[PDB]
Amino acid sequence: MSDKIQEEILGLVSRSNFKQCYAKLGQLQKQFPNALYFKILETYVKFKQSPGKFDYNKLLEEPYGLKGTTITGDTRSLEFLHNFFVELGKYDEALHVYERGNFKFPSYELSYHWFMKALEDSNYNQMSKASLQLAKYSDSGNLPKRAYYFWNAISILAVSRFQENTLSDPKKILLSRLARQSLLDLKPFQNVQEIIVYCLVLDELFPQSREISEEIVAITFANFDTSVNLYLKNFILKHTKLLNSPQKLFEVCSKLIEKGLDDYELITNLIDAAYKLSKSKDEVKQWIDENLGDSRNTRLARLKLDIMYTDSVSESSLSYYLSKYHNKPCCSIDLNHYSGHINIDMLKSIMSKYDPEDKDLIHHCNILELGLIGSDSINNYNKFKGTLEKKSVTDYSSCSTFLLEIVKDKCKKTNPELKDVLLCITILENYQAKDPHNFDTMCWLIVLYMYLGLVPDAYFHFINLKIKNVQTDSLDYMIFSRFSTLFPNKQSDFYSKTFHEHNNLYDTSLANLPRYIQVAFERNSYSKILGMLEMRDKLMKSYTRWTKTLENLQFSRLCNDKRGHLLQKLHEDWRSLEMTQSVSFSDNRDFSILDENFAQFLNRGKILEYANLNEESIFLTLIRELIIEALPNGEKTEQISALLKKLPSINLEELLNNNLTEVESASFLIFFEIYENNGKNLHDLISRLMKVPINAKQNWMVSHTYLTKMATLKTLDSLKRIKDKEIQKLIKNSLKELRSCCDDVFKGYSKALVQAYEELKKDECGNLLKELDVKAENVKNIKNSLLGIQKSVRNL
Amino acid sequence: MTTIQPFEPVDLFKTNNVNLDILTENFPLEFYFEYMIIWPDLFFKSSEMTVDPTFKHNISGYMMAKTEGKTTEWHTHITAVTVAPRFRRISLASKLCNTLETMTDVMPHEVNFIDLFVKCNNQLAIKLYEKLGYSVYRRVVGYYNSAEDGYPDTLKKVDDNKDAFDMRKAMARDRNRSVRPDGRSHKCYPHDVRF
């Protein structure tokens, strides 16, 4: 009955029909004079009608604020107060009322409710307080009192890892002391998870403590007698090494290895401990081989023993490992880890000793990466392109290493030419026709098209990857980054289906996290909680998560779509970040999937300038979108003003150029002039925006520079506060040339590609094309894709 | 070199090097959470210390399992096994299978046997499983039937591209009670597999 009123009142509040809300609440008031929930509803309705007309301090600070005295135990009344306080950005007072409510009316239900809602706000300090209240009143609860004390420890662990800024220096020691003593009083531990939390509490809240390491080592080693646990393996390995006890390290490794754990970390620690125990090299080698047999680690343990005992890898141990793995993909990384101790010629001679029949495709790839022989990708691929027709369809071909090496070499140039970009496209497309499931070359074909702006053929690749769930956050950045200025086609499956299905991670899965968080605590899966705690934090700060919403706001603006609902979610997302008291963005993009050294390759590669997006660029784009909402009101907001100070205290012009494109930099300065300076300088500012050249060599900038101009002008047209006649003349006149040059630029872009194809057929590109045993693909197909983009751009 | 490491929930962002494989399923994000909530200890990954985490993901694979059944049916079920393309055909798939053996044969699990479902046409997996001591117990007709395919109506019709093998290994404590040499000739509906 309480809920049924809530949406009815909110629905009438939503439709701005506030008049009958008071009477119906008054009817509820006369029936329920003591129901403070209706009193909270009244203020909520009052604030919605006119936020600037009702005194927040008089009506909310004194009854319910941080000094609030009006304290009630009704869960619904407190929930609505927390909701309204969060809606006002008063997160401190939002969770303050529940602590006071639990203080005035302590109960297992109210403490449980406080724990849940504080969990939603990521206030790890509050669950530490909330869990303790549950422990005292655990008598009426469904869980043992020992569970809640661990919950306090986990919450303390939560503050230590992610909310260390919220603790004063004396408080850290007090909470550290509290965490250990609560878990000590519950000894003996009932299960593995309880042991892990105590070890987790000691490991990070008492670092570099000698007695802490010994205590953890003792208890974990005792549990190893009957059960095998990997978490305790991590605990015992780290602290025993800190103990500087080679005898204990040898015993621990020997105990776990004898139990069937084939781990190189155990082997390395066994190897390191034996040397400090002065064990002979042969004794350790036979002991490892006797207990572990012939494995990848055991063969490579001998190489580790060679470096530790002789500072150089002996030919006996290396050849033994090369006896089985010379033609394996893992040979590359294993020998590279020891490249500083291995003689290259001695390794080279062994590779030349093997039979040419054993010198298979993988063997040459291992040769090519080791630098033993000069790059012969063209011949090696030609030699091994015969493996393409005999390999399994689902199996990946290692011939990509040859072809990608050529692709990388050309792409290492700072300014790829039009023919150079097209040259790599031709090579990979034929290989991808031969190797449909090979993501290594297929990802590069994707990246090649996006730089040229050719979305439709690149999007044809994504559906074949079957990207879903976690892969959306880490791999959609090649395609959905800045999508509003590249492929603004609402009717396309690209946006209608692929984009919409990818949002389910953020709109649905992200909201479903709290339910799974609760069961983990209740099922005593405390160990996964801390890692799963990091999972949610990175999600709301994800680069892809923030980019897609802001770009969609521009895309909705570009297509004249409604933005009132869209902004509301942005404020909720912005509110969600703010209550976590850590305003930051999480770069979860997987740049390593394309190249090992992609970090060095991002900033120098113009091939990925469309994906060059940092925290400063993301934060700025949020500011521009937030200005859009505030401009029709014409009022400066403290929300925007405070964020402006958080920007670097440098010249604003230079900050844009380091994180945003030139056209975006001009457009960014456009919105500030009207917002900050009341728009006195648009006449010069708009002229500079139109003076931005649009040349056929700009590749993806051509679509970007056109649509950024298209997006910003449409905003200023729809902004009704523009009253000066003269600036109104140029804004519409500037649009005229923008509509006119819609096809002029594209046919120039279309024309420019044609000569590049002719350049490919001739000179060095043609000669290698004959060497490639690959003939140039037809021009007409990609032109239709480019003309298809021009087809959609006209209707915009 | 390969080291067996716990699979943290945030490691899902570091699994692209394994997840882009065509036969490796990227399960719904909720499904990844369910396994670690009830059975965290068996949710681990294979990592390479030779691969620097700063420049590239070092995860070579991840193993999902569960324990079901009662009394004689108490067993560990292997759900999905995957190995990164860079680390295949080097018996690392065998190591993870043996890793579940030593983990579940001792306390607190002490399971009677290990079972899993593999498609009948998956000859690559069938030879791998049978090599390590696993034995086929029954053929699950229509295990991978979609909604369009509907529920199988008869066990007489069998298709290798649709039926799955109830593909088992017996432990020492089982005394081979849960395995039989004639498991291929036994057929049952997907609903008959209840624990």
Coordinates of C-alpha atoms in Angstrom, one line a residue, chain A residues 332-795:
Chain A
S332 CA 58.8 -17.5 -28.8
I333 CA 57.9 -16.1 -25.3
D334 CA 59.8 -18.6 -23.2
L335 CA 63.2 -18.0 -24.9
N336 CA 62.5 -14.2 -25.0
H337 CA 62.2 -14.2 -21.2
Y338 CA 65.8 -15.5 -21.1
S339 CA 67.2 -13.6 -24.1
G340 CA 69.6 -11.8 -21.9
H341 CA 71.4 -15.0 -20.9
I342 CA 71.4 -17.1 -24.1
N343 CA 74.0 -17.0 -26.8
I344 CA 72.2 -16.2 -30.1
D345 CA 74.6 -18.2 -32.4
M346 CA 74.4 -21.2 -30.1
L347 CA 70.7 -21.0 -30.3
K348 CA 70.8 -20.3 -34.0
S349 CA 73.0 -23.4 -34.8
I350 CA 70.5 -25.7 -33.0
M351 CA 67.6 -24.2 -35.1
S352 CA 69.7 -25.0 -38.2
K353 CA 70.4 -28.5 -37.0
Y354 CA 66.8 -29.6 -37.2
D355 CA 65.5 -31.3 -40.3
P356 CA 63.8 -29.2 -42.9
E357 CA 60.7 -31.4 -42.5
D358 CA 60.6 -30.4 -38.9
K359 CA 61.3 -26.8 -40.0
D360 CA 57.5 -26.3 -40.3
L361 CA 55.5 -23.1 -40.4
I362 CA 55.7 -22.7 -36.6
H363 CA 59.4 -23.4 -36.6
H364 CA 60.0 -20.6 -39.1
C365 CA 57.7 -18.2 -37.1
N366 CA 59.8 -19.0 -34.0
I367 CA 62.9 -18.3 -36.1
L368 CA 61.5 -15.0 -37.4
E369 CA 60.6 -13.6 -34.0
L370 CA 63.9 -14.6 -32.4
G371 CA 65.8 -12.4 -34.9
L372 CA 68.0 -15.4 -35.8
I373 CA 67.3 -14.9 -39.5
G374 CA 66.5 -11.6 -41.3
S375 CA 62.8 -10.9 -42.1
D376 CA 61.7 -13.0 -45.0
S377 CA 57.9 -12.6 -44.5
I378 CA 57.2 -12.5 -48.3
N379 CA 59.0 -15.8 -49.0
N380 CA 58.0 -17.6 -45.8
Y381 CA 54.3 -16.8 -46.3
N382 CA 54.6 -18.0 -49.9
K383 CA 56.4 -21.1 -48.6
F384 CA 53.7 -21.7 -46.0
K385 CA 50.6 -20.4 -47.8
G386 CA 50.1 -24.0 -48.7
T387 CA 49.3 -24.6 -45.0
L388 CA 46.2 -22.5 -45.5
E389 CA 44.3 -25.0 -47.6
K390 CA 45.1 -28.0 -45.4
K391 CA 44.6 -26.4 -42.0
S392 CA 41.3 -26.6 -40.2
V393 CA 38.7 -23.9 -40.8
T394 CA 38.5 -23.0 -37.1
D395 CA 42.3 -23.3 -36.8
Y396 CA 44.3 -20.1 -37.0
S397 CA 47.1 -19.9 -39.6
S398 CA 50.5 -18.7 -38.3
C399 CA 51.1 -17.1 -41.8
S400 CA 49.6 -13.9 -40.3
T401 CA 52.9 -13.4 -38.5
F402 CA 54.6 -13.0 -41.9
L403 CA 51.8 -10.8 -43.3
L404 CA 51.3 -8.7 -40.2
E405 CA 55.1 -8.1 -40.0
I406 CA 54.8 -6.4 -43.4
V407 CA 51.6 -4.6 -42.2
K408 CA 53.4 -3.4 -39.0
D409 CA 56.5 -2.2 -40.9
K410 CA 54.4 0.0 -43.2
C411 CA 52.2 1.1 -40.2
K412 CA 55.2 2.1 -38.2
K413 CA 55.4 5.1 -40.4
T414 CA 54.2 8.3 -38.7
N415 CA 52.1 9.4 -41.6
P416 CA 50.7 6.5 -43.6
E417 CA 50.0 7.3 -47.3
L418 CA 46.7 6.7 -49.0
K419 CA 48.3 4.0 -51.1
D420 CA 50.1 2.7 -48.0
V421 CA 46.9 2.3 -46.1
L422 CA 45.2 0.7 -49.1
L423 CA 48.2 -1.6 -49.7
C424 CA 47.8 -3.2 -46.3
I425 CA 44.1 -3.5 -46.9
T426 CA 44.6 -5.6 -50.1
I427 CA 47.1 -7.9 -48.5
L428 CA 45.0 -8.7 -45.4
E429 CA 41.6 -9.1 -47.2
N430 CA 42.9 -11.9 -49.4
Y431 CA 44.5 -13.6 -46.4
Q432 CA 41.3 -13.1 -44.3
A433 CA 39.4 -14.7 -47.2
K434 CA 41.8 -17.6 -46.7
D435 CA 41.8 -17.3 -42.9
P436 CA 38.3 -16.3 -41.9
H437 CA 38.7 -16.8 -38.1
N438 CA 42.1 -15.2 -37.7
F439 CA 41.5 -12.2 -35.5
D440 CA 45.1 -11.0 -35.7
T441 CA 44.9 -9.9 -39.3
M442 CA 41.1 -9.3 -39.1
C443 CA 41.5 -6.7 -36.4
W444 CA 44.0 -4.8 -38.5
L445 CA 41.6 -4.8 -41.4
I446 CA 39.1 -3.2 -39.0
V447 CA 41.5 -0.6 -37.9
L448 CA 42.6 0.2 -41.5
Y449 CA 39.0 0.9 -42.5
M450 CA 38.2 3.1 -39.5
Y451 CA 41.2 5.4 -40.3
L452 CA 39.8 5.8 -43.8
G453 CA 36.3 6.2 -42.4
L454 CA 35.0 3.1 -44.2
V455 CA 32.5 2.0 -41.6
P456 CA 30.2 -0.3 -43.6
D457 CA 32.9 -2.8 -44.6
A458 CA 34.6 -2.6 -41.2
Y459 CA 31.3 -3.2 -39.5
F460 CA 30.9 -6.3 -41.6
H461 CA 33.9 -7.6 -39.7
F462 CA 32.6 -7.0 -36.2
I463 CA 29.5 -9.3 -36.7
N464 CA 32.0 -12.1 -37.5
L465 CA 33.9 -11.5 -34.2
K466 CA 30.7 -12.1 -32.1
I467 CA 31.7 -9.5 -29.6
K468 CA 29.5 -9.7 -26.5
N469 CA 29.5 -9.3 -22.7
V470 CA 32.9 -8.3 -21.4
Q471 CA 34.4 -8.0 -24.9
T472 CA 32.1 -5.0 -25.5
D473 CA 33.8 -2.8 -22.9
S474 CA 37.3 -3.7 -24.1
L475 CA 36.9 -4.0 -27.9
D476 CA 34.1 -1.7 -29.0
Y477 CA 36.5 1.2 -28.9
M478 CA 37.8 0.5 -32.4
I479 CA 34.2 1.1 -33.7
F480 CA 32.0 3.0 -31.4
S481 CA 34.6 5.7 -30.4
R482 CA 33.3 9.1 -31.6
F483 CA 30.6 7.3 -33.7
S484 CA 28.5 10.5 -34.0
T485 CA 31.1 12.0 -36.3
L486 CA 31.8 8.9 -38.4
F487 CA 28.7 6.9 -39.2
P488 CA 25.5 8.7 -38.2
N489 CA 23.0 6.2 -39.6
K490 CA 20.2 5.5 -37.2
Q491 CA 18.5 3.1 -39.6
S492 CA 21.6 0.9 -39.9
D493 CA 22.0 -2.3 -37.9
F494 CA 25.3 -0.8 -36.7
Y495 CA 23.5 1.6 -34.4
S496 CA 20.0 0.0 -34.2
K497 CA 21.2 -3.5 -33.2
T498 CA 24.9 -3.8 -32.6
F499 CA 25.1 -0.6 -30.5
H500 CA 21.9 -1.2 -28.7
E501 CA 22.8 -4.8 -27.7
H502 CA 26.2 -3.5 -26.5
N503 CA 24.5 -1.1 -24.1
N504 CA 23.0 -4.0 -22.1
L505 CA 26.3 -4.3 -20.2
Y506 CA 25.9 -0.8 -18.8
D507 CA 22.1 -0.3 -18.6
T508 CA 21.2 -3.8 -17.3
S509 CA 24.3 -5.8 -16.2
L510 CA 25.7 -2.8 -14.3
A511 CA 22.4 -2.3 -12.4
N512 CA 22.3 -6.0 -11.7
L513 CA 25.6 -6.0 -9.8
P514 CA 24.2 -5.2 -6.3
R515 CA 22.0 -8.4 -6.3
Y516 CA 25.1 -10.6 -7.0
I517 CA 27.1 -8.7 -4.4
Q518 CA 24.7 -9.5 -1.6
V519 CA 24.6 -13.2 -2.3
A520 CA 28.5 -13.4 -2.3
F521 CA 28.6 -12.0 1.3
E522 CA 25.7 -14.3 2.3
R523 CA 27.3 -17.4 0.7
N524 CA 30.6 -16.6 2.4
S525 CA 32.5 -16.1 -0.9
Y526 CA 34.5 -13.3 0.7
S527 CA 37.6 -14.0 -1.3
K528 CA 36.1 -13.1 -4.7
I529 CA 34.4 -10.0 -3.2
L530 CA 37.4 -7.8 -3.2
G531 CA 38.3 -8.6 -6.8
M532 CA 34.6 -8.3 -7.7
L533 CA 34.6 -5.0 -5.8
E534 CA 37.1 -3.6 -8.3
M535 CA 34.9 -4.9 -11.1
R536 CA 32.0 -2.4 -10.5
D537 CA 34.4 0.5 -9.8
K538 CA 36.1 0.3 -13.2
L539 CA 32.7 -0.1 -15.0
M540 CA 31.2 3.2 -14.2
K541 CA 34.6 4.8 -14.9
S542 CA 35.1 2.8 -18.1
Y543 CA 36.3 4.8 -21.1
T544 CA 33.9 3.0 -23.4
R545 CA 31.0 3.5 -21.0
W546 CA 31.4 7.3 -20.8
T547 CA 32.3 7.8 -24.5
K548 CA 29.2 6.0 -25.8
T549 CA 26.7 8.1 -23.8
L550 CA 28.4 11.4 -24.5
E551 CA 28.7 10.6 -28.2
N552 CA 25.1 9.4 -28.3
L553 CA 24.1 12.7 -26.8
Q554 CA 25.8 14.4 -29.7
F555 CA 24.3 11.8 -32.1
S556 CA 20.9 12.4 -30.6
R557 CA 21.5 16.1 -31.0
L558 CA 22.7 15.6 -34.6
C559 CA 19.5 13.7 -35.5
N560 CA 17.3 16.1 -33.5
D561 CA 16.4 13.2 -31.1
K562 CA 15.0 13.9 -27.6
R563 CA 17.7 14.3 -25.0
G564 CA 15.7 15.0 -21.8
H565 CA 15.7 11.3 -20.9
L566 CA 19.3 10.9 -22.2
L567 CA 20.6 13.7 -20.0
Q568 CA 18.7 12.2 -17.0
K569 CA 20.7 9.0 -17.2
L570 CA 23.9 11.0 -17.6
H571 CA 23.2 12.9 -14.4
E572 CA 22.4 9.5 -12.7
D573 CA 25.7 8.1 -14.1
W574 CA 27.4 11.3 -13.0
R575 CA 25.7 11.0 -9.6
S576 CA 26.8 7.3 -9.4
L577 CA 30.4 8.3 -9.9
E578 CA 30.2 11.2 -7.4
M579 CA 28.9 9.2 -4.4
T580 CA 31.9 7.0 -4.8
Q581 CA 33.9 10.1 -3.7
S582 CA 36.5 9.3 -6.5
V583 CA 35.8 11.2 -9.7
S584 CA 38.0 9.5 -12.3
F585 CA 37.8 7.4 -15.5
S586 CA 39.0 3.9 -16.1
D587 CA 40.9 3.1 -19.3
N588 CA 39.8 -0.5 -19.9
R589 CA 40.4 -0.5 -23.7
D590 CA 42.5 -3.4 -24.9
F591 CA 45.2 -1.9 -27.0
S592 CA 47.5 -4.9 -26.6
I593 CA 45.2 -7.1 -28.7
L594 CA 46.6 -5.4 -31.9
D595 CA 50.3 -5.0 -30.9
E596 CA 52.6 -5.9 -28.0
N597 CA 54.0 -2.3 -28.0
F598 CA 50.8 -0.6 -28.8
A599 CA 51.2 1.9 -26.0
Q600 CA 54.3 3.3 -27.9
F601 CA 52.3 2.8 -31.1
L602 CA 49.2 4.8 -30.0
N603 CA 50.7 8.2 -29.7
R604 CA 52.9 8.0 -32.8
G605 CA 50.4 6.1 -35.0
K606 CA 48.1 8.3 -37.1
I607 CA 46.5 5.0 -37.9
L608 CA 44.9 5.1 -34.4
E609 CA 44.4 8.9 -34.0
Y610 CA 40.7 8.3 -34.1
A611 CA 41.1 6.1 -31.0
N612 CA 43.5 8.5 -29.2
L613 CA 41.2 9.2 -26.3
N614 CA 42.5 10.0 -22.7
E615 CA 40.9 11.1 -19.5
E616 CA 41.3 14.7 -20.3
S617 CA 39.5 14.3 -23.6
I618 CA 36.7 12.3 -22.0
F619 CA 36.2 14.8 -19.1
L620 CA 36.1 17.7 -21.6
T621 CA 33.4 16.1 -23.7
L622 CA 31.3 15.7 -20.5
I623 CA 31.6 19.4 -19.9
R624 CA 30.4 20.4 -23.4
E625 CA 27.3 18.1 -23.1
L626 CA 26.5 19.5 -19.6
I627 CA 26.7 23.0 -21.0
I628 CA 24.1 22.0 -23.6
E629 CA 21.5 21.4 -20.9
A630 CA 22.3 24.6 -19.0
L631 CA 22.4 26.9 -22.0
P632 CA 18.6 27.1 -22.6
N633 CA 18.2 28.3 -18.9
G634 CA 21.1 30.7 -19.4
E635 CA 22.3 30.2 -15.8
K636 CA 25.7 29.2 -14.6
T637 CA 25.5 26.0 -12.4
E638 CA 27.8 25.2 -9.5
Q639 CA 28.0 21.6 -10.9
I640 CA 29.6 23.0 -14.1
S641 CA 31.6 25.7 -12.3
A642 CA 33.2 23.3 -9.8
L643 CA 34.2 20.9 -12.6
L644 CA 35.8 23.8 -14.5
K645 CA 38.3 24.4 -11.6
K646 CA 39.1 20.6 -11.6
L647 CA 40.5 21.2 -15.1
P648 CA 44.2 22.1 -15.3
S649 CA 44.8 25.7 -14.4
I650 CA 46.4 26.5 -17.8
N651 CA 45.3 28.2 -20.9
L652 CA 42.0 26.5 -22.0
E653 CA 42.9 26.8 -25.7
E654 CA 46.0 24.6 -25.4
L655 CA 44.3 22.0 -23.3
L656 CA 41.8 21.2 -26.0
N657 CA 44.5 20.7 -28.7
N658 CA 46.3 18.1 -26.6
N659 CA 43.1 15.9 -26.2
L660 CA 40.6 17.0 -28.9
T661 CA 40.7 17.5 -32.6
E662 CA 41.1 20.9 -34.2
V663 CA 37.5 21.2 -35.2
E664 CA 36.4 20.0 -31.8
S665 CA 38.7 22.5 -30.2
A666 CA 37.1 25.4 -32.1
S667 CA 33.6 24.0 -31.3
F668 CA 34.5 23.5 -27.7
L669 CA 35.4 27.2 -27.3
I670 CA 32.1 28.1 -29.0
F671 CA 29.9 26.9 -26.2
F672 CA 32.0 28.6 -23.5
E673 CA 31.6 32.1 -25.0
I674 CA 27.8 32.0 -24.8
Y675 CA 27.8 30.2 -21.5
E676 CA 30.6 32.3 -19.8
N677 CA 30.9 35.6 -21.8
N678 CA 27.3 35.8 -23.0
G679 CA 28.5 35.1 -26.5
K680 CA 30.2 38.4 -27.5
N681 CA 32.8 36.8 -29.7
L682 CA 30.9 34.2 -31.8
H683 CA 31.3 36.3 -35.0
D684 CA 35.1 35.7 -34.9
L685 CA 34.7 32.3 -33.3
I686 CA 32.2 31.0 -35.9
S687 CA 34.4 32.3 -38.7
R688 CA 37.4 30.4 -37.4
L689 CA 35.2 27.3 -37.2
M690 CA 34.3 27.6 -40.8
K691 CA 37.9 28.4 -41.8
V692 CA 38.9 24.8 -40.7
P693 CA 39.9 23.3 -44.0
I694 CA 38.3 20.1 -45.3
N695 CA 40.8 18.3 -47.6
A696 CA 40.5 14.9 -49.3
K697 CA 43.6 13.7 -47.5
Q698 CA 42.1 14.0 -44.1
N699 CA 40.7 10.4 -44.2
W700 CA 38.5 9.9 -41.1
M701 CA 38.7 13.6 -40.3
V702 CA 36.6 14.4 -43.4
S703 CA 33.5 12.8 -41.9
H704 CA 34.6 14.1 -38.5
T705 CA 35.1 17.7 -39.5
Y706 CA 31.9 17.8 -41.5
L707 CA 29.7 16.3 -38.8
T708 CA 31.3 18.3 -36.0
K709 CA 30.4 21.4 -37.9
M710 CA 27.0 19.9 -38.6
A711 CA 26.4 19.0 -34.9
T712 CA 27.5 22.3 -33.4
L713 CA 25.6 24.6 -35.7
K714 CA 22.4 22.7 -35.2
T715 CA 22.8 23.3 -31.5
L716 CA 23.2 27.0 -31.9
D717 CA 20.2 27.1 -34.3
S718 CA 18.0 25.4 -31.7
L719 CA 19.3 27.6 -28.9
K720 CA 16.6 30.2 -28.6
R721 CA 18.7 32.6 -26.4
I722 CA 20.5 33.8 -29.6
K723 CA 18.8 37.2 -30.1
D724 CA 21.4 39.4 -31.9
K725 CA 20.3 39.8 -35.6
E726 CA 23.8 39.8 -37.1
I727 CA 25.0 36.6 -35.5
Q728 CA 21.7 35.0 -36.5
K729 CA 22.5 35.9 -40.1
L730 CA 25.9 34.2 -40.3
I731 CA 24.8 31.0 -38.4
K732 CA 22.1 30.2 -41.0
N733 CA 24.4 31.4 -43.9
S734 CA 27.2 29.2 -42.6
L735 CA 24.8 26.3 -42.7
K736 CA 24.1 27.0 -46.4
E737 CA 27.7 26.2 -47.4
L738 CA 27.7 23.2 -45.2
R739 CA 24.7 21.7 -47.0
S740 CA 26.1 22.8 -50.3
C741 CA 29.6 21.3 -49.8
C742 CA 27.9 18.0 -48.7
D743 CA 28.7 16.3 -52.1
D744 CA 31.7 18.5 -53.1
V745 CA 34.0 17.1 -50.4
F746 CA 32.9 13.5 -50.8
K747 CA 33.5 13.3 -54.6
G748 CA 36.9 14.8 -53.8
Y749 CA 37.5 12.1 -51.3
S750 CA 36.1 9.6 -53.8
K751 CA 38.3 10.9 -56.6
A752 CA 41.5 10.9 -54.4
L753 CA 41.1 7.1 -53.7
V754 CA 41.2 6.3 -57.4
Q755 CA 44.7 7.6 -58.1
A756 CA 46.0 5.8 -54.9
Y757 CA 44.7 2.5 -56.5
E758 CA 46.6 3.3 -59.6
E759 CA 49.7 4.1 -57.6
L760 CA 49.3 0.6 -56.0
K761 CA 49.4 -1.1 -59.4
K762 CA 52.7 0.6 -60.3
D763 CA 56.2 1.3 -58.9
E764 CA 57.2 -0.6 -55.7
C765 CA 53.6 -1.4 -54.7
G766 CA 52.9 -3.1 -58.0
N767 CA 56.1 -5.1 -58.0
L768 CA 55.4 -6.4 -54.5
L769 CA 51.8 -7.1 -55.5
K770 CA 53.1 -9.5 -58.2
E771 CA 55.5 -10.8 -55.5
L772 CA 52.5 -11.1 -53.1
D773 CA 50.8 -13.5 -55.6
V774 CA 47.8 -11.3 -54.9
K775 CA 46.0 -9.1 -57.5
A776 CA 44.4 -5.8 -56.6
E777 CA 40.7 -5.9 -55.6
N778 CA 38.2 -3.9 -57.5
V779 CA 37.7 -0.2 -56.9
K780 CA 34.0 -0.2 -57.4
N781 CA 33.2 -2.1 -54.2
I782 CA 34.7 0.3 -51.7
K783 CA 33.5 3.3 -53.7
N784 CA 29.9 2.2 -53.1
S785 CA 30.7 2.0 -49.4
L786 CA 32.1 5.6 -49.6
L787 CA 29.1 6.7 -51.8
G788 CA 26.9 4.9 -49.3
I789 CA 28.2 7.1 -46.6
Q790 CA 27.7 10.1 -48.9
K791 CA 24.2 8.8 -49.5
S792 CA 23.4 9.0 -45.7
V793 CA 25.2 12.3 -45.2
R794 CA 23.0 14.2 -47.6
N795 CA 19.8 13.4 -45.7

